[PDB]
């Protein structure tokens, strides 16, 4: 088969490839943090990279930060309307291979 | 030699790369933003987390729009040659493709252009990795009971 | 340890967690669609499940669509404004799990 | 019995669950819109592949903006206990955050709020994947050289 925009003889990747946002909540979501402890996803996120950086692929300890900081947090507040809220992380990735942290 | 396949990045250059956090706390009185207690901690968890990493850690406290802009300019145009990849993370206030400096928004596509695969050559194939810590919005999660 | 934001007795999840975006571009750009072979996004995705579903984990698969669609493909077009450009695919979690179609 | 992890979800129910297509060739003039020629080779593709990981494909051809939100509502509102997830693939125009009807835009959001954790419970805990071919914005990447 062949077509019109495949197999180029100078090989280019976007300029937007490679990029990996690690959002600490959803679109359009506010974002949690303890005044004292920190916030959820940066506690999350650290905590779970001392524990996996050098055992699993990147995006595997982003997931395990998802399920942390949405089953293990709610928030705490004397106003009602920000109280008993729950957040969940937001992994967005545009990287083309997979990153581990060791070698 | 063998078969190579290359579904991983490359993370064996002479260093693993630049961990730039920027953690705003204080804010202009200006702006009429308060201080986001708590973040120093994060900002201290991360150091020590990436510092374990093998990563060359920067920590900036309470940074203009002006300072962030002018030191991602100033980074992306250094030479990762050696470095295996980038990181850089936001702690501060924010909504939706925005960061705030201690004095206005900074829209994150102007920071991260900088390292865009044609803007900065040396990190090109190179995983950027971008932690943001803030709001995106003003909904709140009810959640649901399991 | 303690917080009034943690371990709360009704266990309660976000209600915007478990939702995966395998969106075909990235945020703000143009989607490519070969008007005889399809879009670059589908071919490569497809292309993908139909090698690794039963062996990888679905955030590497979308990670191999990724690489193919960005070094793969390139634009063509009578318009030079539309001619010869790239595109990234962008895969937004918020997962809690590993997602395995096989079991 | 032994070590339970659970870091994986149970895909293991008596069905894997609904593969929704919506494939969208031929909109109203009155959109101005042109045809999307292609896309039943999208659509034909994406049922034969998970048709072979044993999903439930339902193909949808050129639905109105309406219809849309009918066909989401009705499925959303279906007994998902015995599946183990969800999926809906979108092929048409869009803009960021949106999806063409035949006839007029929706927002994914509204799309999506139907299968939110606590508006469908049978599919509560279990993975709802959107897969989206679709223009995002205006924006061209010109790429870089390797």
């Given at each position: 088969?062949?077509?019109?925009?495949?197999?180029?003889?100078?090989?280019?990747?976007?300029?937007?490839?490679?990029?990996?946002?690690?959002?600490s909540?959803?679109?359009?979501?506010?974002?949690?943090?303890?005044?004292?402890?920190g916030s959820w996803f940066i506690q999350s996120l650290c905590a779970m990279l001392?524990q996996?950086?050098?055992?699993?692929?990147?995006?595997?300890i982003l997931?395990r930060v998802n399920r942390k900081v949405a089953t293990e947090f709610?928030?705490?507040?004397?106003?009602?309307?920000?109280?008993?809220?729950?957040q969940?992380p937001?992994?967005?990735?545009?990287?083309?291979?997979?990153?581990?942290?060791?070698? | 030699?063998?078969?190579?396949?290359?579904?991983?990045?490359?993370?064996?250059?002479?260093?693993?790369?630049?961990?730039?956090?920027?953690?705003?706390?204080?804010?202009?009185?200006?702006?009429?933003?308060?201080?986001?207690?708590?973040?120093?901690?994060?900002?201290?968890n991360?150091?020590?987390?990436?510092?374990?990493?093998?990563?060359?850690?920067?920590?900036?406290?309470?940074?203009?729009?002006?300072?962030?802009?002018?030191?991602?300019?100033?980074?992306?145009?250094?030479?990762?040659?050696?470095?295996?990849?980038?990181?850089?993370?936001?702690?501060?206030?924010?909504?939706?493709?925005?960061?705030?400096?201690?004095?206005?928004?900074?829209?994150?596509?102007?920071?991260?252009?900088?390292?865009?695969?044609?803007?900065?050559?040396?990190?090109?194939?190179?995983?950027?990795?971008?932690?943001?810590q803030?709001?995106?919005?003003?909904?709140?999660?009810?959640?649901?009971?399991?």
């Open positions: 088969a062949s077509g019109v925009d495949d197999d180029m003889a100078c090989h280019k990747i976007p300029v937007e490839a490679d990029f990996l946002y690690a959002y909540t959803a679109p359009g979501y506010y974002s949690w943090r303890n005044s004292k402890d001392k996996y950086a050098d055992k699993l692929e990147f995006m595997h997931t709610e928030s705490f507040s004397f106003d009602a309307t920000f109280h008993a809220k729950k969940i937001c992994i967005v990735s545009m990287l083309t291979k997979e990153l581990y942290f060791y070698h | 030699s063998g078969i190579s396949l290359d579904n991983s990045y490359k993370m064996d250059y002479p260093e693993m790369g630049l961990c730039i956090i920027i953690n705003n706390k204080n804010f202009h009185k200006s702006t009429g933003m308060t201080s986001r207690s708590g973040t120093d901690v994060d900002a201290a991360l150091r020590e987390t990436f510092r374990n990493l093998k990563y060359e850690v920067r920590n900036k406290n309470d940074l203009t729009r002006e300072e962030i802009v002018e030191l991602m300019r100033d980074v992306s145009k250094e030479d990762h040659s050696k470095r295996s990849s980038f990181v850089c993370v936001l702690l501060s206030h924010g909504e939706e493709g925005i960061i705030f400096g201690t004095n206005g928004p900074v829209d994150l596509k102007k920071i991260t252009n900088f390292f865009r695969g044609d803007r900065c050559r040396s990190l090109t194939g190179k995983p950027k990795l971008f932690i943001i803030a709001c995106r919005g003003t909904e709140l999660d009810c959640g649901i009971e399991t």
